[PDB]
Structures are given as C-alpha cells and as structure tokens.
Amino acid sequence: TDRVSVGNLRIARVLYDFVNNEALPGTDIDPDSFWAGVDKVVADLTPQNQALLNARDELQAQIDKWHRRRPIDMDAYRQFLTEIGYLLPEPDDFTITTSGVDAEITTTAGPQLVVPVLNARFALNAANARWGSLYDALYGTDVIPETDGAEKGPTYNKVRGDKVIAYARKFLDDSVPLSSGSFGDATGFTVQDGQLVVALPDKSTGLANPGQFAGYTGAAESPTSVLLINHGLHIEILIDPESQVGTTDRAGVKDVILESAITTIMDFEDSVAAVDAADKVLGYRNWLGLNKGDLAAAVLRVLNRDRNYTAPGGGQFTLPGRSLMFVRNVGHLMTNDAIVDTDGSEVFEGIMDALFTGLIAIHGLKADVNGPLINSRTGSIYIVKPKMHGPAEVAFTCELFSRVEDVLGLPQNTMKIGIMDEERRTTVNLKACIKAAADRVVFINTGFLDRTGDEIHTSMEAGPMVRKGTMKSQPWILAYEDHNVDAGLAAGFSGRAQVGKGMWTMTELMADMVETKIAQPRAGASTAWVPSPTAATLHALHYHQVDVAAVQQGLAGKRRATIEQLLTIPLAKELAWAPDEIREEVDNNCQSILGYVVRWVDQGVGASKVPDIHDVALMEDRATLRISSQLLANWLRHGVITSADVRASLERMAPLVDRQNAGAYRPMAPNFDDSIAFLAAQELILSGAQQPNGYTEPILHRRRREFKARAA
Ligand SMILES: Cc1ccc(C(=O)/C=C(\O)C(=O)O)cc1
Ligand SMILES: [Mg+2]
Ligand code: NI
C-alpha cells in the first residue's frame, strides 16, 4: 500500500529501496535512468507479453474444441495444429552463433544443480558444490549398502569407510587407469618429470594416459593432494597419512574430491514461493550476495575461493572453487504486485525478473563494490527461461533481454538464455525456438516434469490419461527426450552449448540414481539436473564413465524422432484400470499435492521432500504439482473419478500429511474447510482444467497471499 511512483509504475517501497540502496550501487546505472527505463520496458513489452499469453489460450481453446468434436485421425490432428499456427514449419539447418560463453557450458559435461534462491544456506551450498567429497557422498548415502556391518552409526563405522574407500579406488581405476595394477594397491604418490607416479606393493607404475595428471599441491616428493582430470572433470586425491582416514589407508588418502556441480541454477521459479515484493526481495538479496561473492551464514560459512595447484611440470594455476551460476527467472504468465500500474494492473513478473536479476548479475562480472567473487569470467549473464510456449515466446524473451541490456548498459547478447524444453509447443517447434535465440541460447533442457503437465493439459479433452508412473514409458516422452538432443546437436550445441536433461527427484535413492541416471549422459546430454550437492558428486561418477562428447559425435545427423511420435497423446486404453489401481492413483496424487501445497501455502516453501504412498521421499516442485493436479483434473473431466472421490482422498490423506510434519506446522485435520492450504489443494484439482496451460501458480499465489493476509 506504500509505493513509489515512477511513471505509470507503483513500485512497492521494499523493492525500490533494495534496488536503489543494494543492487544499483556499483553498476554505473543512475537510479533515475534505471527506473525510467524499467517503466519504459514494462509499458511497451507488456502488450506483447499479453498477446503471447492470449495466443496460448486461443490455441488451447481451438484444441479443446477439436477433441470435443472429435478412434483418433492423427494425420488430421497434425494438419489442424498446422492450420491454427500451433505446428509451424521447421526452419532449415543452422549453427547457433552464441559467443562469450563460459567453458563449463561449451566444453564441460557434468551435473547441473538446481536450488531455490530463497534459501541462502542452500544457495551457499550449491555454489560451493563445484567440489564435493566422494567419500562423504558415498558414506552418507545408500550407494554403499547398510549391510554386513556397514551400517551408518552415530559414530564413524570403519567397515562402512572401507567399502567407501574401496568404491572410490574402483572409480579411480575406471576413470584414470594405471599402466599396471590398481589404485587399490597404491601405497603412495610422487610427481617426477612432470609425470605422476604411484607406488605399488611391488613395482611403481604411472598413468595409462599421463595427460590425465593435471596437477598437485605440496612438495613434488610427497603431495598433499594429486589432481586428476578425466572427460574435462577434475578428481582430487587428498593425501594425509596423519589424518584419521589416511592413517588406515594404504596410501594415506584422506578423501577423493570430485568436481561435481559444474553449473548451478539459482531458481526464482518452481522451487520457491515468491508471491510479493517482500518475498522477491529476499531472493534478489540472496542473488545479490552470490553475485557480490560475500553471501555468508553463521551456524562462518562462506562462498569458496578458487583452488590453486602446481601444474604437472612447473606452473601454479587456479581452478574455479564455485559452481558457475545461472538464474531461472519465472516464465511469462505470472504477475506480481511488487509493481502495480496506475490502474492497479500488476506488472509481469518475467519482465521484472529480467531487469532485477539482470541488474544484480552485473556485480558477478567484476571484482571493493561489486564484491570480491566473479561468476562468469566471460561477462555473460545466464538466465534460464522456463515455460516458453513456442518460438514467438522465445523471440519475445530475446527482445526482452535486448531491452534490459539497454536499460542496464550492457552489450547486446550479454544475457544468455537457457531454454527449457518443457511445453508441448516448444517441443514440436524446438528447432525454430533455438533459431529464435541462435545468438543467446546457451542450453536446452528437457523439463520433463512440466512437459508431462503440458502434455496432459493440452489433450485434457481427448480422454483419460495414463497413470502418472506410466508417463515415463509413453511414446511421446521418449521421442521428446531424443528429439531435444537431436535438435540441439543439429544446431551446433556440441562444444557450443549444453544439452541438458531433467531432475532426479528421489533424493534418498542414490544407489538407484547411480544405477539409472547414467542413461542421461549415455543419451548424449552434456548435463542433467540433481537436487543436491551430494547428488551432484554422485552423478559426477556417470560423466567419468560416459564420454559425453564422444556420444554426441556418434549421434550427429541422426533424426530419431518423428513428428507423429511427438504428437502421440498418452491416452489410457479401454477397460483401463481396476478400482484398485484408480484409488491408488488418487491417494498417491492427493498426498503429493497436499504435502507440497501445505508447505507452499503455510510457510512459503517451494521445494519439499514429500513421501508418496510407497514412502519414497520425493523432492517436489511446482512441475510435479502440475502433473498430479492436471492428471486428477483429467481423470475427473472424463469420469474416471468423482469430485467427491477426490475430496474423500484429500480428507483421508490430510492427517497422514499432518503426521508427516510437525516443525511450526499447522495441522490440516480436522478443520478441513477452514485450512487455506487444504482448499488450495482441492482447487488445484477441481479447477485444474481451467488454469492457463494447467499452471499451478495462479491458485498457489493467490492462496499464499490470502494465508499471509490472514496473518493480519
Ligand atoms: C527440486 C526440483 C527443482 C527443480 C525442478 C524442475 O524445475 C524441473 C523442471 O523444470 C521440469 O522437469 O519441469 C524439479 C525439482
Ligand atoms: Mg519446469
Ligand atoms: Ni574415457
């Protein structure tokens, strides 16, 4: 209610003051001009942000009418989408021209960690996760089974530590082979002639490929750590025979450190509840501390500094201590009262984010004002833009970034774009979307969770969908994943840009992650998303076993996905399911909505571990909420289930979600109809069909605001 008028804009004062007193000092931008430019960018690109948002509903309306009129003529289907401007012609082959891109993106294949920018500790850890102890990763997770006396105890279990050490020596054997013998046999390491030599219990061998020896610390004659490289990622053997772990170790190894989270996406979108100017500032403030380089916590944990090594021959070089940081703005749909206009119309959140995260990112290009730590050593600003539907929304984002770079005084194409392939209209037009961003594009990623949501909502009217667990094997999603890699490699992404795959959500099943997430490097993705620093280092194993660049060479030119397979709607069969299976699917989805929503609405937490009805802790975000809510809406709109069926499941799941929590937590049960979060969940399902492209934000935002408001 207390705002600052600049032009047609009414800036909430908390935002204005933050920009003026915290973000703008050090950017060379005079606050007068910046706001005047903000007002100017808002006023003129709001029309096209609104046109594009209008195109989405009218395309969807035409599709909904087509299915309801109508046993499905697929040639006619694809022709209709071509006729309404949903499917557009493929452009002809081209190479992306994006320049000034950090090497972690162009060349390096490895994990990419995603973290809510609103949690400064998490963001701190994510930035520091560029380096991760393989030992702590293995010890702390189920990768080493708690069996035969290897169970995690309140104190260090030396049986567990041995399987840890043994596992890591196996890894080193597969990544950096010795000419003869194994690292398990190693008794010590020295550097001679610029070449690493390892002491065995009989002879002394070297590296199979000595070029994998990348450096060391300490004296040549007994390093405190040897630095190894494999497939562009560094491995560090910490050597300390006096350390407790090193004392037991054949070679005095204290730890093996993996280069892990090569890049990190600091997220303003599906993993945060940022509903108003107060919420947005907390996130912008964290983004500012990360770009300054002085973000810190007590309970003093700092951002890591760079790591220095002696080069194998002479030299004293330096590797990045922290993960190269992206920011994920919100998409184009949502609106935020942080800025209202003269007439009360909220300003578009995506525009605001581009200017504010853009402005703040200026500090991360220098190192004393701007703070001491550099993010991009190439002057690029990395914004992944999510939920774009089609190439005209990409073009608008590039124009948007163009205008922001004007207001901000940056050269053009400073603001690079990570395109989320995660709406159906981007999938079937992906090559045109990359073209629309040919000079700003820096990755594509299959947002397979939002993409499933878009899939269900687009063909909502076609009939019941398969159960959610079944989507992973549907023709459309398998073509979607292969198509994304193809189009990226056809666009020149190899060595120029990242081809990225989606998020491992089972944060407690690391053994399974180590077993199955290798499929993503093996399919040619140069990065894949991990929810956690620990997961980053474990998923880093996979880039040591799979030569991602070599996989992408072999995939060149191959077109493994037809337009017809991309358009295969995941409809369920005839007799479908037993009431058995139906109820399981309803209970499962209702408990995943409720568990996620209650923390979103009552505590403004956008990313929660939520056990499903098989007691598997799932890291849940808005995208997973969108699937669950759209699938029940679809099952509802076709009579697979009843509105009272959905309420009964919500009623019976609420107490079990209540007992999955406690704290600061507010019990949903028994006063269901007067718990705001409960009604938010119910409305996400009962009104799921009505939301624009099934997005959950409109209902989540307004219910969060209303919860905040009843905290009067
Ligand atoms: C913990 C977490 C963080 C981010 C995401 C997410 O953004 C996925 C995608 O963008 C997409 O699969 O839709 C999921 C879980
Ligand atoms: Mg997504
Ligand atoms: Ni190899």
Side-chain angles (χ1 to χ4, degrees):
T1 300
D2 272 345
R3 293 170 173 278
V4 184
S5 42
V6 177
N8 270 324
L9 303 194
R10 297 300 178 277
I11 325 294
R13 186 126 183 252
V14 66
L15 180 52
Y16 183 76
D17 282 357
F18 165 83
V19 167
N20 287 354
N21 306 341
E22 296 187 62
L24 281 172
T27 61
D28 298 319
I29 312 173
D30 302 50
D32 40 310
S33 35
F34 169 85
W35 289 114
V38 159
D39 159 69
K40 183 66 214 222
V41 174
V42 169
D44 61 15
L45 316 192
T46 291
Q48 339 169 22
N49 203 326
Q50 189 50 90
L52 286 158
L53 274 202
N54 284 335
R56 294 187 193 180
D57 203 332
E58 82 175 76
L59 265 49
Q60 187 58 49
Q62 294 177 90
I63 287 145
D64 284 326
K65 171 188 197 297
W66 191 95
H67 277 296
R68 259 179 308 174
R69 262 188 93 81
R70 81 209 258 169
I72 167 169
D73 187 2
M74 173 69 36
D75 269 328
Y77 185 53
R78 166 207 341 140
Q79 254 300 109
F80 175 69
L81 304 173
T82 296
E83 193 112 348
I84 66 180
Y86 180 108
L87 258 79
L88 316 165
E90 225 181 41
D92 296 333
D93 291 57
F94 69 94
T95 305
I96 61 168
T97 185
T98 318
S99 69
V101 169
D102 281 86
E104 292 100 331
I105 306 182
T106 62
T107 315
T108 325
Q112 177 160 107
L113 169 55
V114 181
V115 154
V117 82
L118 213 76
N119 186 311
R121 289 84 95 81
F122 284 17
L124 195 53
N125 296 340
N128 287 336
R130 172 72 168 251
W131 298 86
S133 156
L134 181 52
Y135 281 23
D136 301 330
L138 294 168
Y139 193 100
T141 67
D142 62 307
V143 173
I144 288 126
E146 298 183 69
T147 204
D148 315 320
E151 53 283 334
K152 289 167 208 149
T155 82
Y156 173 66
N157 175 4
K158 290 211 164 268
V159 176
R160 204 175 160 81
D162 286 342
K163 314 204 149 216
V164 170
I165 287 139
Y167 192 114
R169 269 158 164 74
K170 272 111 128 235
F171 158 82
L172 298 167
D173 280 340
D174 282 339
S175 310
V176 302
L178 302 179
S179 271
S180 294
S182 92
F183 283 87
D185 301 327
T187 89
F189 314 80
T190 55
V191 314
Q192 274 87 305
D193 323 316
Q195 300 323 316
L196 203 269
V197 310
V198 315
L200 284 192
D202 65 294
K203 58 170 142 65
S204 267
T205 206
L207 297 190
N209 171 24
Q212 284 192 313
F213 175 42
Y216 66 98
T217 67
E221 289 68 34
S222 68
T224 43
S225 78
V226 311
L227 173 73
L228 272 36
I229 188 168
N230 184 49
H231 304 163
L233 308 154
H234 291 101
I235 308 165
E236 184 149 18
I237 296 151
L238 255 60
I239 303 159
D240 184 4
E242 302 202 298
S243 71
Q244 176 153 342
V245 156
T247 288
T248 85
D249 181 271
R250 331 300 286 170
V253 181
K254 178 202 194 184
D255 209 334
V256 180
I257 311 301
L258 302 189
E259 222 187 341
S260 312
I262 291 317
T263 62
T264 290
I265 303 184
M266 305 282 177
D267 192 32
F268 287 80
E269 203 230 19
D270 279 14
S271 43
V272 310
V275 152
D276 49 45
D279 283 352
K280 284 298 235 168
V281 165
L282 304 185
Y284 294 150
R285 183 167 286 113
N286 295 343
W287 180 235
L288 181 65
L290 286 156
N291 277 289
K292 285 267 182 67
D294 65 345
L295 194 62
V299 163
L300 202 138
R301 215 158 75 255
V302 292
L303 291 156
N304 287 338
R305 304 321 198 74
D306 300 318
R307 308 157 77 84
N308 326 91
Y309 300 89
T310 305
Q316 268 285 144
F317 72 95
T318 286
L319 295 180
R322 73 209 70 92
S323 176
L324 171 70
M325 318 178 45
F326 296 45
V327 80
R328 176 150 76 156
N329 293 5
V330 302
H332 300 122
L333 164 85
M334 269 318 279
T335 206
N336 203 285
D337 70 36
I339 306 182
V340 297
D341 85 317
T342 40
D343 317 285
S345 284
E346 279 168 286
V347 158
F348 274 121
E349 213 178 316
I351 307 170
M352 260 178 308
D353 271 0
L355 287 139
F356 297 136
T357 70
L359 164 65
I360 291 152
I362 293 161
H363 292 286
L365 321 175
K366 334 168 210 315
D368 41 35
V369 85
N370 311 125
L373 266 36
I374 304 206
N375 189 45
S376 156
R377 215 78 196 65
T378 56
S380 274
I381 299 187
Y382 298 118
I383 298 158
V384 317
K385 188 78 185 186
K387 291 173 174 53
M388 305 201 246
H389 301 242
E393 305 203 352
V394 173
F396 170 69
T397 300
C398 295
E399 205 59 90
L400 171 68
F401 286 5
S402 188
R403 299 292 269 90
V404 159
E405 294 156 345
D406 259 35
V407 165
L408 293 184
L410 317 181
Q412 283 269 131
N413 310 328
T414 280
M415 278 162 69
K416 305 316 205 281
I417 314 188
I419 286 160
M420 304 289 307
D421 185 340
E422 59 175 356
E423 309 295 339
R424 193 161 111 146
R425 250 214 297 157
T426 296
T427 299
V428 309
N429 299 286
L430 183 65
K431 157 184 254 191
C433 295
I434 301 178
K435 197 207 228 309
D439 42 308
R440 301 167 177 284
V441 64
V442 84
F443 68 59
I444 61 182
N445 203 84
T446 40
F448 79 105
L449 292 158
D450 272 306
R451 179 67 180 71
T452 307
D454 203 45
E455 184 71 31
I456 301 175
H457 184 84
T458 309
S459 317
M460 168 78 52
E461 292 288 348
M465 297 310 194
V466 300
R467 313 181 48 180
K468 157 202 293 175
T470 299
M471 282 291 183
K472 89 168 188 174
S473 35
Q474 285 289 299
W476 75 264
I477 203 165
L478 307 165
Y480 154 74
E481 300 274 16
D482 289 350
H483 182 67
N484 167 92
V485 166
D486 288 2
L489 292 170
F493 272 50
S494 193
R496 288 183 192 80
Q498 276 161 354
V499 165
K501 291 202 172 294
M503 164 75 56
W504 181 268
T505 47
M506 296 121 284
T507 62
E508 292 334 308
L509 307 177
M510 289 302 108
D512 190 28
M513 195 200 60
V514 165
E515 151 196 304
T516 81
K517 210 174 167 51
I518 188 159
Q520 290 174 324
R522 271 191 204 142
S526 47
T527 66
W529 287 5
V530 291
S532 147
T534 295
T537 89
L538 289 171
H539 181 39
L541 299 188
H542 299 151
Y543 296 84
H544 292 289
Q545 313 164 36
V546 190
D547 190 319
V548 163
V551 176
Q552 302 180 345
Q553 253 204 19
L555 288 170
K558 282 152 96 293
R559 296 324 155 202
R560 287 167 306 153
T562 59
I563 184 56
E564 173 175 33
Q565 295 176 311
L566 292 155
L567 301 176
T568 303
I569 300 163
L571 291 171
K573 56 168 189 76
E574 324 314 324
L575 256 303
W577 313 282
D580 168 28
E581 317 163 70
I582 289 170
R583 204 261 196 72
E584 167 178 304
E585 183 77 17
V586 183
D587 281 1
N588 191 53
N589 286 300
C590 282
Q591 196 233 27
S592 297
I593 296 147
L594 277 171
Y596 181 76
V597 170
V598 68
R599 301 239 300 185
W600 215 105
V601 162
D602 294 354
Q603 300 172 62
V605 171
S608 310
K609 286 184 190 210
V610 171
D612 68 357
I613 266 65
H614 307 122
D615 202 330
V616 177
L618 306 171
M619 193 60 182
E620 301 239 311
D621 79 325
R622 250 135 60 183
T624 203
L625 178 61
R626 166 143 94 120
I627 297 168
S628 279
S629 56
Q630 284 302 285
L631 186 65
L632 291 175
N634 164 257
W635 276 26
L636 215 34
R637 147 86 199 79
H638 297 290
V640 174
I641 57 177
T642 290
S643 67
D645 284 353
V646 166
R647 167 85 185 218
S649 173
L650 284 175
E651 292 205 6
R652 100 173 44 90
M653 294 299 135
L656 318 177
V657 168
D658 284 344
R659 206 211 100 201
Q660 225 280 313
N661 293 263
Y665 173 86
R666 313 322 281 280
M668 290 196 151
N671 289 27
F672 293 134
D673 210 356
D674 307 59
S675 153
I676 295 184
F678 181 89
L679 309 177
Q682 172 183 266
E683 178 176 18
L684 279 175
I685 304 166
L686 301 200
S687 293
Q690 227 165 256
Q691 307 315 303
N693 307 277
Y695 290 141
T696 64
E697 289 95 338
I699 292 173
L700 275 178
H701 277 227
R702 146 172 80 261
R703 292 269 172 193
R704 174 66 175 162
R705 294 195 292 98
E706 153 199 352
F707 178 92
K708 291 190 177 207
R710 285 200 337 195

